[PDB]
Design a protein around this ligand. Sequence first.
Ligand SMILES: Cc1cc2nc3c(=O)[nH]c(=O)nc-3n(C[C@H](O)[C@H](O)[C@H](O)COP(=O)(O)OP(=O)(O)OC[C@H]3O[C@@H](n4cnc5c(N)ncnc54)[C@H](O)[C@@H]3O)c2cc1C
Ligand SMILES: Cc1cc2nc3c(=O)[nH]c(=O)nc-3n(C[C@H](O)[C@H](O)[C@H](O)COP(=O)(O)OP(=O)(O)OC[C@H]3O[C@@H](n4cnc5c(N)ncnc54)[C@H](O)[C@@H]3O)c2cc1C
Ligand SMILES: Cc1cc2nc3c(=O)[nH]c(=O)nc-3n(C[C@H](O)[C@H](O)[C@H](O)COP(=O)(O)OP(=O)(O)OC[C@H]3O[C@@H](n4cnc5c(N)ncnc54)[C@H](O)[C@@H]3O)c2cc1C
Ligand SMILES: Cc1cc2nc3c(=O)[nH]c(=O)nc-3n(C[C@H](O)[C@H](O)[C@H](O)COP(=O)(O)OP(=O)(O)OC[C@H]3O[C@@H](n4cnc5c(N)ncnc54)[C@H](O)[C@@H]3O)c2cc1C
Ligand code: PRO
Ligand code: PRO
Ligand code: PRO
Ligand code: PRO
Ligand SMILES: [Cl-]
Ligand SMILES: [Cl-]
Lengths: 383, 383, 383, 383
Amino acid sequence: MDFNLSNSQSDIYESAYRFACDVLDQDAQTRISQKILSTELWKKAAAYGFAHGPVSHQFGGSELGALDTALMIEALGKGSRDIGLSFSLCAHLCACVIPLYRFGSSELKDKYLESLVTGKLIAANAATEPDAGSDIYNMQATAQPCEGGYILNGKKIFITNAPIADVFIIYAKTNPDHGFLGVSAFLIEKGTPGLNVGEVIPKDCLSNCPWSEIVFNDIFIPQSQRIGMEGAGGAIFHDSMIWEKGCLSALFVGGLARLLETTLEYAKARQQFGKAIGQFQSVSNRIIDMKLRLEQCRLMLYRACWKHDQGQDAEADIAMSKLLISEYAVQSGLDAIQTFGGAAMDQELGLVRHLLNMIPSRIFSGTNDIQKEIIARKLGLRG
Amino acid sequence: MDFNLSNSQSDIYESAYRFACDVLDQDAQTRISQKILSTELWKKAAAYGFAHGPVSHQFGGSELGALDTALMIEALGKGSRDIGLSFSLCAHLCACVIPLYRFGSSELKDKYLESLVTGKLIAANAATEPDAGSDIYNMQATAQPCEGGYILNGKKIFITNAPIADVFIIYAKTNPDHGFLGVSAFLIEKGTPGLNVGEVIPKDCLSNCPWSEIVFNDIFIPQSQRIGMEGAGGAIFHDSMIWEKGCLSALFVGGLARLLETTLEYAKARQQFGKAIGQFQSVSNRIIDMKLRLEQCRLMLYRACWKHDQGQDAEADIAMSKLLISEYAVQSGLDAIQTFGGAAMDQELGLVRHLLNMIPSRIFSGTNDIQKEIIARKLGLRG
Amino acid sequence: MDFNLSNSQSDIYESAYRFACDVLDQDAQTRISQKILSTELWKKAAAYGFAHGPVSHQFGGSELGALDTALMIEALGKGSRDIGLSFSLCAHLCACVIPLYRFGSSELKDKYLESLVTGKLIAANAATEPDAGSDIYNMQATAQPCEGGYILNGKKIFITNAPIADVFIIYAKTNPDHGFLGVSAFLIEKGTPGLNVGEVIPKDCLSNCPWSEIVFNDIFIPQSQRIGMEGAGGAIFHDSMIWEKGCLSALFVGGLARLLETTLEYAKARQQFGKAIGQFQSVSNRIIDMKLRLEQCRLMLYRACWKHDQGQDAEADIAMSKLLISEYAVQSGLDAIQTFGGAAMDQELGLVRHLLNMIPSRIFSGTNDIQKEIIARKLGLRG
Amino acid sequence: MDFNLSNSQSDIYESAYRFACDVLDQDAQTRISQKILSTELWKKAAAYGFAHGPVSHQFGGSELGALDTALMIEALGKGSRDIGLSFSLCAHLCACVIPLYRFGSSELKDKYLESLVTGKLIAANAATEPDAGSDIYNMQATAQPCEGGYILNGKKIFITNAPIADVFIIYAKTNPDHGFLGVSAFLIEKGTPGLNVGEVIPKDCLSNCPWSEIVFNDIFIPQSQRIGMEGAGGAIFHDSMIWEKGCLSALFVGGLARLLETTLEYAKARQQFGKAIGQFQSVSNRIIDMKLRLEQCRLMLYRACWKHDQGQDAEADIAMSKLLISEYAVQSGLDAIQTFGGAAMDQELGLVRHLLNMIPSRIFSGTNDIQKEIIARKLGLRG
Ligand SMILES: Cc1cc2nc3c(=O)[nH]c(=O)nc-3n(C[C@H](O)[C@H](O)[C@H](O)COP(=O)(O)OP(=O)(O)OC[C@H]3O[C@@H](n4cnc5c(N)ncnc54)[C@H](O)[C@@H]3O)c2cc1C
Ligand SMILES: Cc1cc2nc3c(=O)[nH]c(=O)nc-3n(C[C@H](O)[C@H](O)[C@H](O)COP(=O)(O)OP(=O)(O)OC[C@H]3O[C@@H](n4cnc5c(N)ncnc54)[C@H](O)[C@@H]3O)c2cc1C
Ligand SMILES: Cc1cc2nc3c(=O)[nH]c(=O)nc-3n(C[C@H](O)[C@H](O)[C@H](O)COP(=O)(O)OP(=O)(O)OC[C@H]3O[C@@H](n4cnc5c(N)ncnc54)[C@H](O)[C@@H]3O)c2cc1C
Ligand SMILES: Cc1cc2nc3c(=O)[nH]c(=O)nc-3n(C[C@H](O)[C@H](O)[C@H](O)COP(=O)(O)OP(=O)(O)OC[C@H]3O[C@@H](n4cnc5c(N)ncnc54)[C@H](O)[C@@H]3O)c2cc1C
Ligand code: PRO
Ligand code: PRO
Ligand code: PRO
Ligand code: PRO
Ligand SMILES: [Cl-]
Ligand SMILES: [Cl-]
């Protein structure tokens, strides 16, 4: 039992924080106003190390553990206001880089993995369908085995980075008779015949992070582009969602640290009735809730990541962390707005935009109701 | 004890609902997308009756009571998606039309009141200052008595309708030695020398409802433009906020009725895991919370308005209603988004925009912490 | 729309309140300390009118409607501390008197109903079994038709009033192949061969209200003691639970009115740091929550009862009322204890005993999770 | 960063857990039923090590750190149902043993400290007065300096262990002109002339843990019985409350671990509607809340204690831990009762008694509103 960061960990955090503040955050307000995702800036962030995670040196990574990866991303969330860019980068890392590294063949990693790790190629993962969201393993896209590979048909929706991706990590049924066990994973390239990437679909939350639909019309997937074994795609997807839950939770912990600092400063500086508004218990009680949340969920995340690094079973701990972090991110966004009153409406301050950016955290990587189902299953409440 | 609407009340509701659906709601999505407040449409709504409230027939009103006025505005909130336009109209009614009618001299009402009632002139009320929000009676704008009237100096912020108003109902100190008892109210016209109306300041919440700052530099206010008695402006403002709390609460009750209908329909229609998502208790329990909220706060509002119509003391009931309605509007907006999952991000559906539009309800007309202070005082907890 | 009580209603309330304060409450602390249920006092309360409800004059009742019955019981809850005695009386009224009146034959009502209405005979209703609680219609007790009537076998648990009852309203399967449609209802007398009433089983909540198990070993039920039609017992039970939900909710509304008055008085009188503790927002904010709850749930209950009196469908409104009242009763009990601090531990003040008495309200007459299932079904979320 | 216990820590926990299960818990139900605090059993627990904490070997302690002390007490809370006995023991340790060890003179420690450490003498701490609870430093008891020592007059209330104590650690004003800085601490013996210990005052919460009032009528305190320096009693008391907050929080963490295990087992075993009740999301969602609480607050407590052991400032962390643990203990007690339904009323199962035992945790050692004031002050919100 020790709650100090090592010097190595402290350095990883502080280097990422400096990069987020001095490189990504500079000019962020202009990009946010114009709903711009700067792919040149994204590539600098990827190459700096945010697209590396646990990837080995062989492929350009630093062989970071889960806790180190989470610290980097916590720093990113605290230091850069451009949370849409950060979300895009973490989706690429967790849903695309990491499954390719963990399950790809030597051939497939040799062709694509270092390019994803350095951000030379941007990747999108495509699992969700119009009738398969929480019930993801009822997806109906089909990768029908054929001579030389697969014929792919289907439609995927809500695909982060699809309008800017060079490659797609896609999930489809190689055996449509089964659910989880009938899914396989594939890498396909932008521009392959039959791949139709939709136009960006705007949204108010994470508004500069592009997503769209993609449609597959008789795409030929060469055999060598299957990721992992036939029928293992359900497990690959599930594994990538454990990494995703943990890393976006880190982003929102860092965002909550930033929000708390802003909110404390305001509550000390803004006077009404001849005293700082933080002196009224209605005001200070909400700020204390924000502090309690931050301290609790940061510890849950660190323990979940450290257990993983130790080889222990950390999946329930990650589901608990994601459930807490996203709920606390939304609630604390509301509490900050209430602290500021009318001044919260100011687009330059970004407090309403911050709440909008947190609203999808309770949906992404499995909704929080699904996290409860995962925890219930680990607790033995599901048969 | 009776919980049925009279035929008269039912007709008032249904006529307002038809007008909101068939006139205001038609083309609303385009106006909302472009952040347009259509002053021609606003004037049609005002003349239809939304700018009338309790005003007598002498000045073009229908002599509606508080409950009738609330029913009209509940219908407006349920029937039109253009909540920014509705908010603008209700601010004009409650913070400008009603204090002029209730406290204005015969001369001042004869010159201006029917024009406000028919929407020929648009009005903004200006009380809030950079250092006087919740502590509103510490405002520092000064209306220094002089030969012929007053010299007005000061700055007002967060003024709904200021970029489109023809007249301003302004509050300023005629005796800066006192707080509540040193305030007087005045009507001034757009274009009077020394009145500088700021450019619209954008916001994400209620985004097509314009507001800005206004600055007074040595404005001369003629004596006849004081509203009510010298030093009575604190009481006039407070009275107008009771009307405002009740009428915007009605708007958000109607909006919650609309949101609940949309959310129930989706939860019955959207299937995952082979059944409607409403069949999972995590989903249905939130929808039931939305229903419970709607039924409770509608009854609180109706009772508060009816007590007022009966001549009973209704101020605590109105503060309770406003506190409940705005909290429940925000919470139910969050619950609807969680019901829809990824589909909530769709700008055409408007669920995130709905939540944004509800966020200021807990600040406007006195924050909900201030409502608690009002209720605490009525309960005898403030000395 | 009217929120005043009629003179008739006001008189019913005030007469019941006087009886609760001047007759039942006098000496209550001694009975509560000794865990005594005074059957002589219970009979006085029954004869005064608390055992009458909607029963016609023909059988000794006053033909009160649901709202009048609820007002009487609200007064009882506000005026007498002996909530265990009040609960016992209301269980007799709602689960035994009312189904006999509503479904009994002329013969059976002529023999027993006036005696129950005047409290000459005390009744217990017995539906719950060790394996049938929320799933009540899976009860396994069997009333096997035979020449002359039925042979009854089975075991019932959690039976309020069983150690003091003269008659039992019991539910059992006349067709064990079905659930809801296989249940019938019967009246049986204390002392009939094969009826074994268990010894009182102590509890900390409602601690002077006796309950126990009862066992049926080859009881012969004469044909004339069936209540209503063969196979209608599921519907009779369900109907009696609608009356029960509404009347115990009234008791706890009255108890919350009493608790709020006590808590407000203390928060004004108790000083720390040189001021009344109600002046700290942490303290006043909880008291305001208690007030908000009381006003909201009282209105929901009154509307539910009035809709029933009007002939409208009131079952969802009653389920909503019961769910709100019992949750708010428990939460406000907790808030009162927090207001008083160390002084809450005083057995003479009864605040901890009050919380204990409210804890079962969320279980009784169908748990609050089951109320949500009922409301979900009314909302169309259950297929 | 490490979240494993050392072998030493694991052994401390497991030895305390065995002692709580095999010695204290055996026969607990009889003692609880009879409201017995067994002083022979208490002395065995004290001598086993629960009265040692950080005390040095010189005085019979083991020189445990805060985290080790907390682990021992977590084990005690999980392993023994007799929480009243455990509370009594921890009050003796934290409010009496620890301030004597930390501030007593060599002479005073030599005379009394080892006897307290081995439980040969039982101690009560007496700070609270009828008009000084949260405002503790406005206490009015006076220790007026005189030749040879002090003359003590005053009244103390809510004194845990007073009916069974051999010695009293008492706080009184040596300079009544000041608050915090006018308090001194003293040790006095049972039986000294002018000390009147009141009869035990019963309570439903922690019902076998005795407390009473004590009155001082012209007690002579010899000079050598002052604990620490003149005027340092406010600081000694405050320091002892930091130890108390942490150690009773540990007791309630262990109690929550026990409650969760019981509740999970029931939710898997109890069937309704043909499935385990844990399969309904209304049921499993509350159990998941209990799990989330336990994991979060255990980590907060461990970090607070470890920071103290490291020499870092841990007072805010302890206030946060106490606030979380006591709130979560109460809420999870409510959630367990709701899980069990009617079966929660069983006195043998102890679930209602468990909730009663947790209710005072939010009051003791400074109410949770006062904890928020402490945290607000650490956050810079109090001037
Ligand atoms: C910001 C964002 C980025 C995204 N990026 C990607 C991406 O890059 N690639 C990709 O493939 N997908 C992506 N998604 C989609 C995401 O995977 C789905 O939105 C998510 O899994 C939820 O599915 P759904 O939207 O269809 O909601 P539904 O599954 O329809 O859920 C609707 C409601 O039903 C509840 N519900 C459903 N099942 C249950 C159940 N068994 N028990 C209790 N409640 C239940 C849900 O919790 C929710 O409250 C993204 C989503 C978001 C919000
Ligand atoms: C949509 C919108 C439209 C508006 N339109 C108008 C208009 O047309 N005309 C006009 O004059 N103004 C208008 N206002 C301004 C509104 O009156 C103020 O925003 C409101 O009174 C709150 O003041 P403030 O923003 O300065 O917040 P502050 O008063 O600075 O409040 C900051 C925080 O401190 C809390 N706080 C302050 N005092 C206390 C206290 N005693 N006890 C406990 N907590 C306290 C507040 O509740 C809040 O949480 C509008 C505001 C909004 C959001
Ligand atoms: C004070 C008191 C007086 C009583 N008096 C009587 C009396 O006089 N006569 C009589 O016959 N009975 C009486 N009862 C029993 C009462 O009817 C049952 O306790 C009640 O119906 C709950 O059943 P149970 O205790 O078996 O809980 P269970 O049904 O075992 O419930 C355990 C948990 O599972 C939840 N649960 C069960 N099903 C679902 C579901 N489909 N969905 C979601 N959650 C679910 C429950 O809400 C609860 O949280 C009394 C009970 C009490 C507390
Ligand atoms: C189980 C138990 C064991 C105890 N054992 C001992 C013992 O052994 N020795 C001893 O000396 N005392 C003991 N106490 C007393 C304990 O110290 C006091 O009960 C506690 O400090 C609260 O004081 P009070 O009861 O007078 O509540 P009050 O201070 O009257 O509090 C009443 C309410 O006012 C709130 N309040 C007060 N001040 C503020 C404020 N500034 N801001 C916001 N809210 C405020 C409180 O939070 C509470 O909600 C014990 C108490 C308990 C419950
Ligand atoms: O297995 C999981 O973790 C995925 C996430 C979205 C639906 N279920
Ligand atoms: O008196 C009121 O109602 C006003 C509203 C804003 C500040 N206080
Ligand atoms: O139908 C009802 O209302 C009953 C109440 C207990 C179980 N279900
Ligand atoms: O200083 C503290 O920690 C004490 C605890 C009770 C009142 N204040
Ligand atoms: Cl305060
Ligand atoms: Cl469910």
